[PDB]
Amino acid sequence: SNQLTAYTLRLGDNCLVLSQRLGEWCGHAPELEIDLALANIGLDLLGQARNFLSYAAELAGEGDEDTLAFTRDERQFSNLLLVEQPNGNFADTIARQYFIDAWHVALFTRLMESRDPQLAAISAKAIKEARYHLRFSRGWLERLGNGTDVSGQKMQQAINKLWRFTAELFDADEIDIALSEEGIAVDPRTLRAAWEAEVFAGINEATLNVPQEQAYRTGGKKGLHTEHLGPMLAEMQYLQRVLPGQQW
């Protein structure tokens, strides 16, 4: 049960933390249509976070989505390093979004065949949203990559700058493997063909280059984060930390 709890929490944390990042964009986008789009995506992802986290709390037999989101520190958070990356410029946000959406599509597609029924149902809802996200993020990848020289250059830099964190998308640990062998979880290593087929094509159509640097950064799933996560949680959790144990 502990393995399933940790696995479920990882998925929730990915969505929680990415949703947080998107929230920072509110009112700051290049166009009103983009503000709307980013808030929409952030809202979908928070929805998924609430679902995964609620299930994790049920699996653990205590707490709820709020005890989980607001009373864990950065050493307990299990999100992918990719989702805690700063928003940076719009290309940075689009690169991070596209890498994650391609992954979510590949993952939730397979995870809706989980032998765990609750995981299956969560994934079945999530996949419909992830498909929307991918259309948006890939759409913007192409627009920026094949826009102006300036936008082309920013889209390439954005891709290059996040690349090293893509290794964690296909990292498997014993929790991944044990649960995958029970037909409950998806072994992330087996997601690479699908993700690469998507992402390589998108980058190519965008008239951009797949980075040649071999991706090497992992640790998020084990609670070993970049220095970006601590200040995110400080901001996210302040009120709950100041006034704990209340209803809102």
Binding site: D73, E74, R75, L224, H225, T226, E227, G230
Partner: peptide
């Protein structure tokens, strides 16, 4: 080498 490690707490 030591400065490539993050301060997590």
């Amino acid at each position: 080498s030591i400065f490539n490690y993050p301060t997590l707490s």
